[PDB]
Design a binder for these strands. Structure first.
Length: 189
DNA sequence: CTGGAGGAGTTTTCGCCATGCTCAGACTGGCGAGTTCGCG
């Protein structure tokens, strides 16, 4: 319904409304890793919160996630242990190894922070297993994915992907627009 | 006779909580008036 499109367009114009900016979404995160600028990991930040009933993760604004079928798709900068640590509980190690290789490969598409995290990837409690994690530089505010250079790289990747076929958009009625081969998912439960 | 493969059919991965009472009376109030038949 175009009503939702109009509502988003209007309310996103308000800076404090809470609309995620284009290309970003709010997800669940449990821990953050701290590593020095030299590429050595030391320090883990656990952001999970006790909701009275249970200890549950926290909501964070991050780059949108792919819709993972049976195929392997690497997320940009935040992932679970299987892609990052090359470890899991699924037993099928080769799958995890392939995921890790794809994850490291996607990064290469000059910043010292990404240089450091690349350096750490030369090697890459139990509760971290299976949870979502993010990266932070030792004593650095914010997170690596928040740095402007990361945003430029993300925009470049988006431009890379949005190419080829073009047509008429039914919601807007405009011509020669790139057509979406797949739609992002919607939260259930 | 063997190949490459397009299509048909089967398997894997995906991610993974909640809803909260209740409580009480009235009221007291009077209808109506009436007429029967009659030889052999």
């Amino acid at each position: 319904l175009q009503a939702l499109h109009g509502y988003y367009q209007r309310m996103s114009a308000d800076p404090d409304a809470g609309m995620p900016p284009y290309g970003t979404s709010m997800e669940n995160i449990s821990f953050a890793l701290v590593l020095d600028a030299k590429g050595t990991l030391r320090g883990i930040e656990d952001l999970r919160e006790q909701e009275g009933k249970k200890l549950r993760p926290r909501k964070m604004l991050v780059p949108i996630a792919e819709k993972k079928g049976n195929g392997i798709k690497p997320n940009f900068l935040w992932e679970n242990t299987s892609y990052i640590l090359g470890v899991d509980a699924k037993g099928k190690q080769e799958r995890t190894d392939k995921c890790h290789a794809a994850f490291i490969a996607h990064i290469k598409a000059a910043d010292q922070d990404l240089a450091a995290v690349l350096q750490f990837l030369e090697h890459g409690s139990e509760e971290v297993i299976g949870s979502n994690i993010v990266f932070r530089i030792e004593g650095e505010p914010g997170f690596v994915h928040e740095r402007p250079a990361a945003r430029q790289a993300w925009a470049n990747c988006l431009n890379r992907r949005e190419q080829g076929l073009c047509g008429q958009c039914l919601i807007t009625g405009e011509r020669q627009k790139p057509i979406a081969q797949l739609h992002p998912s919607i939260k259930g439960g």
